[PDB]
Design a binder for this molecule. Sequence first.
Ligand SMILES: CCCCCC(=O)O
Length: 133
Amino acid sequence: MVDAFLGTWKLVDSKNFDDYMKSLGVGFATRQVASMTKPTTIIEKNGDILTLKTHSTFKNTEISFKLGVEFDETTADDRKVKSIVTLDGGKLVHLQKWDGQETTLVRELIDGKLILTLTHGTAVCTRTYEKEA
Ligand SMILES: CCCCCC(=O)O
């Protein structure tokens, strides 16, 4: 079910990431740096457990989860959130909840590229990742 998402992915395009970060309350200096990094996202499975790593020159994160089972997460911008990841329409949908707010991180494969759509408030960011061999 998740298998076409698995592997190593590199950022090759980003639209509206500053809007998304600003909506989350990320400070201007962090937004500066993050507007110029190109993270690598590694998605691996072991049985029912998925691990999603995001690596860059600035920030690194790692989460492990089972689809459909809530987990605690501390995000790159230090939000302590309640998270759940599921498949919906073939998309990997990651919902974070904190302080009554929500954000969604939706990953879709389109013509072999991984398109990550980040929504918080009215801000909608689209980031495109291409697979590494
Ligand atoms: C606040 C976290 C943002 C993650 C952006 C990305 O994985 O490209």
